[PDB]
Every structure is written in structure tokens, then in C-alpha cells.
A paper describes a structure:
During bacterial cell growth, hydrolases cleave peptide cross-links between strands of the peptidoglycan sacculus to allow new strand insertion. The Pseudomonas aeruginosa carboxyl-terminal processing protease (CTP) CtpA regulates some of these hydrolases by degrading them. CtpA assembles as an inactive hexamer composed of a trimer-of-dimers, but its lipoprotein binding partner LbcA activates CtpA by an unknown mechanism. LbcA has an N-terminal adaptor domain that binds to CtpA, and a C-terminal superhelical tetratricopeptide repeat domain.
The LbcA density in the CtpA–LbcA EM map thickens in the middle of the TPR region, suggesting that the TPR domain may fluctuate in multiple conformations. We next performed focused refinement in the top one-third region of the two maps and derived two local EM maps at around 4 Å resolution. To bring the C-termini of these substrates to the CtpA substrate binding tunnel, the TPR domain of LbcA needs to be configured flexibly to accommodate the substrates with different sizes.
Residue numbers in the entry:
A (entry chain A): 38 to 375, 411 to 436
B (entry chain B): 38 to 371, 410 to 436
C (entry chain E): 193 to 268, 276 to 326, 350 to 436
D (entry chain C): 44 to 575
The structure:
Amino acid sequence: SAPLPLDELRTFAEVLDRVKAAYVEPVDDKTLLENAIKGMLSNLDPHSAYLGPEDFAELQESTSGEFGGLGIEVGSEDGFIKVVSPIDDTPAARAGIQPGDLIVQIDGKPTKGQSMTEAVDSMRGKAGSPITLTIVRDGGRPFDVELKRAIIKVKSVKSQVLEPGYAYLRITQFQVNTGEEVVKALNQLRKDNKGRLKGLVLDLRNNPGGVLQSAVEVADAFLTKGLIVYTKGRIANSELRFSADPADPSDKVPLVVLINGGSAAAAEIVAGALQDQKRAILMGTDSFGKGSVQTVLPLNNDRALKLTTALYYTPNGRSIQAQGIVPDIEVGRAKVTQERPQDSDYQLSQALSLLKGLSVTRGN
Amino acid sequence: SAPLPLDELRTFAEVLDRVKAAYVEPVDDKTLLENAIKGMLSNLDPHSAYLGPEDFAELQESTSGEFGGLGIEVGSEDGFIKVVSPIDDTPAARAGIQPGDLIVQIDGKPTKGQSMTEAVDSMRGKAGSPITLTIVRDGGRPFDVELKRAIIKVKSVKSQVLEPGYAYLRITQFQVNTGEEVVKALNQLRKDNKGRLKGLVLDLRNNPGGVLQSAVEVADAFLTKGLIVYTKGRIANSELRFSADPADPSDKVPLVVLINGGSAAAAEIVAGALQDQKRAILMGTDSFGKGSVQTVLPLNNDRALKLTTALYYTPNGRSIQAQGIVPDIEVGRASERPQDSDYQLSQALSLLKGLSVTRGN
Amino acid sequence: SVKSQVLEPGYAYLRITQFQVNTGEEVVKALNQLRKDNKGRLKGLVLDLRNNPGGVLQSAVEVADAFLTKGLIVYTELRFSADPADPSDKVPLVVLINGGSAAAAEIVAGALQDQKRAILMGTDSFGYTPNGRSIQAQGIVPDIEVGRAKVTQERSSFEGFKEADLQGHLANGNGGADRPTGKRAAPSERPQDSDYQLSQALSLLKGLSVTRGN
Amino acid sequence: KYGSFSEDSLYSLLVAELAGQRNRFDIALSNYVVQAQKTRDPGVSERAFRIAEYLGADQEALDTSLLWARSAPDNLDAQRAAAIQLARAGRYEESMVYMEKVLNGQGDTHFDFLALSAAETDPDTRAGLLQSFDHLLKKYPNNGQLLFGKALLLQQDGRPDEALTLLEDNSASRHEVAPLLLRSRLLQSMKRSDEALPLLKAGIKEHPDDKRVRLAYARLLVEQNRLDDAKAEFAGLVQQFPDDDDLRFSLALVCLEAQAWDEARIYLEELVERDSHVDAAHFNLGRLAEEQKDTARALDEYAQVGPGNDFLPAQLRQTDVLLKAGRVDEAAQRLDKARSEQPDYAIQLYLIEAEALSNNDQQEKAWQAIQEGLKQYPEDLNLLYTRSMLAEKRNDLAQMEKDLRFVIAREPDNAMALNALGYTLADRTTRYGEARELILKAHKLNPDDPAILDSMGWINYRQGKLADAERYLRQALQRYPDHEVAAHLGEVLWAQGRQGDARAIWREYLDKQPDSDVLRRTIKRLTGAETP
């Protein structure tokens, strides 16, 4: 028989009445109640917030890389569109599109006078909708190319070989398919070196976050045994524990994790799992220090509030919330005065040197 | 009649109870409802806010003034606290800050998702205390700016003389007495000139504005007839208007107003009235556009809320809100005499000289 | 001679300038006072043997034995066994060679390389060791070669805001204090910050101390 | 487009829905009903009506339903819900008006509820609704559900002929479901299956998918006493859909009644495996065991019957079978333990055993059981009757007389005890005044019961008068022809000196049953000769 907030609701009703009466622009009750919901969710805590239909669709497309379009990453500067990269497995490459190509009209809409966000919005469209592009090559007469909009997946993970025996793997962002992406990347890196991998470096610099399951899957892919992360909340359904399976494609190769100031909850989960397990050596600047797991609860009219349900903990037990993880080797951005990424990037060079020294002192 | 929106109320109640159930920490519904009120008052109108009973109590008798400030007027736009104008003669003025700059981060706390009232209150602090805040200027990357805040008093009106028959009357800020001081300065300049001026360039730029009554007073001090400004709003008492008596201390002097990008409501209103009454001409960057009227009204339980009861209108019907003021002629700003230090002042004085010479009066 | 500057809570830097007489007392006292400064625990003792031409052989052998327990340190018809006595306390060791360690420091570095106790990081020495390999003939090839250089940090115009900054954040799980986004000047530019070689040595030592075990 | 909330309206709805989420639905319903009455908007009214229906407050349900219907007359659902609630409230012609509004917007209608509540309705109000439905038919002759309702009204009146003929006239009505089921019910009322079977088969042809028509046909076939057709119909029904459990139970019952023990046993075994309605399943398993003559299965199935209405008859049948098949010790101990399980059932089962032993004509066990029952529960009148019967068997009238006297004193208005005591006393005692006054009191208390007039005729013959005895025996025959009444008639004929009349009177009952026990006993008592 817990009492209800009668006086509080009376104040709320009085506020709504006075707002509808005294506000300048006539406001229908729909907007006011929507604003009240957004207020509850926003003012409860920083990250939690209401989601609109379009924003919910945006989040769903972000978590699941599959998005409607053609699959070309571009940047608009000086009024002309620069083709940064035509992504693989898309008609863009099959359409003869090349870097730096000057797209003049998207579906007949001129590309000049448009902002970057406006250009991206115009380029994007409903999946399966045919798109005609008028392109001017070297300032010549424009030519028309017809393509079909489809689902394009964005490769979250990028892998390469720095020096013979040393491989580099960067995680742009955590996505649903990131686990299989990491597994296959590790497999292909291992087979590339014909079986032996001297040293591995992982990069999580400026990783805003992602779905928790993918982070746990990556941590499992870089751990033979142990518990990855347990989340606690006042609701039983949220109380959970995720632990690593015996399978480990890494095959016990030295690992170095880079955590920058932009690495957030999802990436910090992998960082903590690989650190507290004594499987990898963190290095860089302090992390974003964000501790929370958020659930999106479906609602009518496909606008679903996302709420922070529980706080996760590192396997040891310490909570990184509001304090984060202090890297073991705090090497900051700097310039050293006496196609290889290490030379340009200082932190990557330091990590490569550390791995080289560790492998050499192992003599293997 | 039309049906009630009961579906939405069902949705709101469901969301409230679900949030109570599935949060990280046990949150009593009182806090949830208070947050709902604050959001319903903030999301729609950035300037408006919910002032609790203790907020209203402290607002009835504000602080004694021992805590100074930065002398920066900010207008919350697109979720970013935007500096509508740094008041002249202040560390903000002395330091490099220009109208339109976004103070994204202040004292290390991001301002996005934060209402302007708490931002300005945090900006207020003890006299002569250091403080650092970020700025995103004209799209440039953030750069920390450290400066010392202290109590600032600025003379409302400062007058000067450029060339025979021409004088320049800068209005730092509209104060309660600004009308009397403006009239006194105009009389002083008239007596010094020994005759009717050849044109009194009025420099209302970088002016956060003040009490509307002062703006009406100045407008009338220049204007002999017409209605300076009228406010319209949904509530019946919202309708208001002002008018100018024939008393004309300006002595029918020619006038040319200047409008930079940092002109606020009061300055906006006076400049718009003068232009729309054909009593002057404008030249400078378009005004900011702020024309709302935030008013505090109580509801119950010894508390009150601040909401935009009504918005202004210049006599010719132009909406001073969402459009700013477009000067009939435009110019971009770009010891040294005042007429040469800034390009806009030089252009204004030269154009006024040409007009007066051509007319022959 | 001995100069003992503690870099981090677990890593301490010891430098030998000149091998004067009875430097064993100075070095052992430095080790003891360091242990007390670190409560009796070390993670790794970078012994920077650079710009040190050397000194009496006996003092160098004394230092070696202070750092070693078994094996024959140096033999030219002369040997030098190793008694267990060692204030080293089984600390991971990283000796540095700048190419200016001529005779005695070179002998110490070579002996510690050969007996596997330590690791040689700096450049090859300018200039016998327990193994058949000589010293004055071939110099001393370091295990990991790191060319000397300088490093400078650049100023951060804006500071990434931590969750302590966002108003109304969530307190950490265990109830501990939340680290704010403050700014306090360092006591001074530590050697780790200036010279690339020593920064590399400290980083490698930290990596070993972490990955090696719990 | 959308209306607006007054402050108090918003407050009320918000608090109501919060309370509803906290399950304090009383506040929710009160606030919602008040706001629905005030605003009268369709949304609030409909939500309030749904809450009331979920809770089930008839007054609030009806108020909200009618308010919703008024708020949005266009909506069909509101009109039908208001009509149903109003019918639930006893006001029926208004519900018929609302149903007319429903029919204006073509859609589903529920007139069977109207007809059933009219059956519940009082005869005067029933006639009012009858005239209202006649007016509707004049307005709406097309509809068939109003025809069903008027036919049900007539059936409640007792003359379904008119409505049945009117329904049969319309081919569409003959083609529907509810009219056909009602026609079957009416035919059963008039008891002419010769027309129910053909029309029911025609309906089965019209839409065999439905189950009600086929079930009605099966019931009519069961009435017809035909078994092959009923079994074929039941098998076809099961094959079409074995899901229904009631269909399976009816199938098993018909199978048992059709002398099909194997398939009935299969159905009972699968029902027991499902363990639904298991008591009757085991009862029928024991029945088919009896039909198979196997005593072990017959007794064990009835022992396995769980407590219930069918258990006690099953227990009595098990006792009878056990006594027939010997094994007195095991049957007695099983019954004794089952009785000690529950005293209330214990008394009934002890009485059953004592009566069975008395019928079987044994003395020691019957007396043991009856005396045990009397000692444990001496106050029960059934035990007193059993002791009186045992005394009559023992040839002593004292115990029976005292027990029946105490029973008569216990119930001043009873008549069965008085008639039994009078008949037994006149059978044994030489004096007839006591039995005469006992039977006179029995007749005054209850003269309709046939045993009362039977004993009256017996005592009147004992007195020696002919007219009164003969008239009372005639009255007993009128109530029910009983062999004891004819026995007293033959006794009167004997006492009047004519032996041929009584000879023929008992010859008729000998023809009724060649080896009747009571007839032989009375013959040896009266005639006194082996050859009557």
C-alpha cells in the first residue's frame, strides 16, 4: 500500500496547464508529453536518454553495420566531393568509381552548395531504391551511372602486418559482427605469417563503444579461460556474468592494448578483461572512465527509451566507473627527434618497440 | 469536439513506471516527476526554466553582489551555449571573444545538455577569481581561454566627437538610468557643437541590452512620433505597446545606426524601431535575433516558473524574432582616431558626411 | 659514484659515473636505501652504465658480485667466482650501453649479459666475459639495440572530459573516490621524459614486470 | 485534431493509471469513470469500460458502457458492449434497441444472450420482450437471430410450433447453426426423432465442419437407440478432430452403451492416461470389466475411482461384486479402511454393507456391521432403519418398534417411518389399533406416497372392513400399481370368501414374474399350500 505522489502529480498538472496557457507558440499536449519523457530520461543521468523513431533507427543501424546505401566513404571539401574510399563488396567498385572522383549530381541533385551532413543525408536513402549518379571526370562532360541501393556492412576491424612477425589490429568501433570479424582477421593474420606470429598489438584508441556481447566475444577471442565481465544492477534480469570459452585463436601471442582518452565502456571492457587477466599490457593515456550497460526497451511507435540498467565490473572486482583504467605504461603523444604506420604514429612505434624487446628477451 | 490524447498519457505513465523499475539505483518517483517538469519546460524553449520554491525565494532577494562575473551574455542555441555578446569594458571584452562564439566546455564540464541558467550561474563567481573555458569559434577547434572574473561596472553611454558636426554615441549597456544619461550626453554634444549636429552616428553594437524601458526611453529621445515597439503573446495581458511623445531632444539631427553581430533584444528593438520609422539607416552585421520576453509567474506551492510570455514586434510589423534586423546597407568590420580604428565607423561617418553635404541643410 | 633516483613506485634508476675505490659500499648502501624507499620490493633496476670509462677491476667485480650469485664473472690465469651474497634481491635488470663504456663498465655489462641475469639495451659499447666471447676485440653487442634520441610532448589545447565532469554521473561501484580532471605540474622533467633510450628501458621493464607473472 | 486536457482531468487520469500499474485498480476505475462521465470522450470512456469489465462491477460497467456508446454512436463495438451490459442489467427492450443500432452497421450480433436472459426474465416482462421482438420482426423480418430469440421465448412459453414452422420456412434459417440446434431441441421437446434425424443430417451436409450439428445428430441417434450409426458418427467426429475432451467422453459413453467393450476400454485407458475426469473413466472401466465378468479388474477399477459423485455408487458396486465373488475378509478390511479414512463416508458405507449383508441372508456379519454403525453413530436415522430391518429379519418386533418409534418422535412430519412401523406392526402384532393409528397419522402427514396407501390397505384388511380397504388399495394403484397393493386386494378377497378372484389376482403377478420372491412369500403366508 505504498502511497502515490498525489501532490507531485498535482504540481505536474499545474505546470502543464500553465505552460499550455502562457507559452507564446500554441503547443499541443503531444509535444509537451514527449518533452516530459525526454526530460525524465535525459536528466536522470548523462548517457541515458529518450530515443525518437529516426534516432532509434540510427542507433539500430549503428549497432548493426548493415545500412542502406551504396557503400562509399567520402568527404566534401572546397565545394567538391572527394571519394575517400569505395568500400569493397559494393557496386561502387564495380561501377568504376575511383578515389577523388568528382560526383556532381546524386539522383540528379547537384552536389555543389551542400554541406557535409546535407550531402551525406542526400546520398543516403531507402534500401533497394535505385540511384542514378551524374559524375564529371577530369572536368569533362558528365556521365550517368545507375546503381541499386543495398545493405552495406562497415568493416569495424582493420588488420595489417607492420614488420615480419608483427601484426596490427585496430577496432574502429564495436559492432554485432565484430566477434566473427576479429576471429577471421586473426585466422588470416596467422596464416599470412605461415603459422607463427611474433607479436601482436591491438588498438582501441577513440572507440566510442558498442554492443556488449561483441566486446565480450573479442575478449574471449583473446583469452583462453577466466571470467570476462559481470554486471550488477537492482534488477535481477540485468545481473549477469560473461566468461571466456576454452577456444582461443590467439595461440598465446604477446599482446599490447592501446587505450586513449576516447576509449569508452565497450572498449574499456576488453581493456579490463585483457589487463586483469595478465594477458596484455595496456599503454597510453587514461581511458574515458565510463562504466555502465544500457538496454534499449522496445516501445510503441518504434521509439524506445535506452536506459542505463547496471554497472559492470572488471574481473578482479574494481569498477572503472568515473575513474577508468590507468594504463601500465603511460606513454603520451609526442614527437621524437634523433607505407609504415609506426613511423608516423608515436604510440604505435613505442608499442612495436616494446613488443620487439619482449620477444627478443624471450628469444623465440 | 476532438478526442483526448489518452494513448500518449498511457505511454507516459508506462514509461515512468518502467523507468522506476529498471534503473541502476532506486529512484523515487518524486525525482522522476521533477525531471519530467524540467524537461517539458526546457526542451521546447531553451531560455525558459523551472524555478523551484527555494529558487523563487532566492530570486526574490538575490545575492548582495559581492560575486562579480565575466560580463558575457549567452543565448542557448542548438544545444550549445552561444555567447550572444561580450559586454565591452570587461575581461571578456579585454580577452579575445567575439559574438557567435560557442562556449562548449566551461571549467571542464561539457555544456551540451545543460540549460543556460545554470551555466551562467556557474560562470558567476567570487571577485577576481581565475576561470578557464573552451571556445569553438567560427567552426575552429576548441582552444582554452583563461581569464579572471571580477565585479564589473560599465558606464551605460559614452559620447565623443569625430569631425565638425559629427559625433559618436556608444551605448555600452542599457541601464535603468540610461535614458537620463543619454539625454544629458545628447544635450552636451548639441551645446558643444554650437548648432544642430550634421549627423549623430549611433553605435549600438556588442550591446547585450538591458531593461526594455531604457530602450523605449532612448528611442523616444530620438523619435518624436510613432510607436517604438509592441509585444504580442497568447495571454490577454501579453499585448503591450509603447509610443514616443513629441519631445525631441535629438534636434532633428541626422542619424545612422550601426548593428554588429552582437546586438541583443533591447538594442535590437531600438535599432529596428528607428529603421522602420525611416528616422535613420543601419549598417553592420545582422543582429543576433533574441526578442523573447522571459517572465516569472507563480503556479502554486510558493514556486514559480520562467517562460516566454510574449515576444516583441517593431512598429512596421517585422518580427524581431527569428529574423534579426537586416540593415538597409551592409558593411563588414575590418594614436589612431575612432573614425579610423574600425572600418564600420569610417564607412558610417563618410556616408553621413556625403548625405549631409548632398542635402545642403 | 653511485646515483640512485627512484623513477616510479616499482622501478628505480641507478647510475654509476666512475668506478672509484670501494664503490661496493656506495652501491650496496644505495640498494638498501632504495629498498627502504620502496619498502623492500623492486620491479626492475635500470643500471645506466653510460659515459663511464671504468676504474679498478676489483671494484667492478665487486659490483658484479653484488648483482650476481653464481658463475665466474670475469677471466682474462685469473677467475672471479660468485658467492651467493647479493643485495640485488633477484630484480629484473636492464643495463644500458651508450657506446662510451670503455673498460670496466663494459666488463660488468658483458658479464651480466652472459650470465643472463640482465639485458643490454643501449648502443654497442666503444670497447673477459664468462663465455668464450671477448670484450675489447668485438665490443659488446647489445641484445636489443635502441638508437639514442630525444622526445618532447606537445600541449593539449583541450582536455578530454572524464565521467567525473558530466554532472550527475554515477558513483563508482566500490564507493571509492572519483578522479577529477585536475592539472598538477610534475616535480620536474624526469629522465624517462627526456632521453628516448631510458624511456624505452623503463617501458620494457614495465612490460616484463606485468606480463611475466601475477 | 486532438482535444485538450483540463488540469484536473490530467491529474485524475495520471493518478488513475499510476494506481492501475500499482494494481490499485479501485482508484483507477473510480477516477476513470468520473472522467469519462465528465469529458464523455470515446477514449476515456472506453478505457474505463475495459477496466470495469476486467474488474466486473455491474453498475460501473453499465454506466461506462452506455456513456461510451453515447460518446461514439458510430462505433459498433461500443454499441454491442452497451447492449450486452444493459441486458445483464435486466433492461432488455433497450438492449434490443441497441442491437438494432448494431444491425444498422452490418456486423456480428449476439442475440442468444438476449434470448437466454429473456428466459431468465419474468413472464410479464417476458411478454413485454415478446411484443418488442414482434415489433422488431415487423421492422426487420430478414434477421434470423431474432427468430431464434422469439423461438426461445415460445419454448419458455411452451408452444414452439409456430416459431419452429416459421424458421423451417426460411431456407437460410434452415441452413444456419443456431436455428438447427434449436430445432433439434424443440423436436426433443415434442419427441419426434423421425424428423430430427433427417433435418440434422441435412444440416451436417450443409456444414459438416461445425461440431454442434454433428453432436446434436449423435444425441438424437442415441435417443433413437440405434448404435451403429451413432458409433460411426462419433468415429468420424473424432477423426475430423480428436481434440475435444467432451467429445471423447461422450464417445466412450456411447461405446459402452453400444456393447463395444474393446474400443470403450481403449478410450477409457487413454482418458485415464490424460488423468482428466478419471473417476468416471475408472467407473466405466469397471463397468466393462463387469461386462467381461472379470472380478479383479471390476473391483480394482472401482477402488481406483477417486472421491466424487460416481465414487460412492462405484464403491457400492464393488461391495456387491466382492460379496458375490467371495473373499469376505479382503473386501471387509478394504471397506473398513476406506471408511475409517472418512467418518462421513464411513457411515454411508457401513450402512451399504449392512444392507447388502441383510439382502444376502446372513446373520452374524450383518448384525456385527449394523451394531458397529449404531455404536459409532447411534443418532443417524438410516442406522435406526437398518436395525429395524435386522430386527424384522430376526423375527422380533420389539427392536424395530422402538427404533421406528424414536425415529417418528425425531421427525414429527415424517411419513415413511410411520408407514413402515404400521405395516411391520400389523404384520407381527395381534392388535391392530396401534398400526391403524400409525398409518392414519402417516396418511394425514403424507397421503400421496404409494407406500402410505399400501400400508393403509393392509391395515384396513386387518381390521375386517372391505369398502375402505378396497378404496385405499385402488388409490394406491392410481398412485402406482404395486404388488403389495394387489397382495392386500387378494387378502381382502380371501377374507370375503372368494378364492377364485384372489387366485387370478396372484396369477397375474406370477405372469408378471415367474419366480418372484415376494409373491411366493405372500402365497405361502396366505394360501398355506404348495399348490395355490
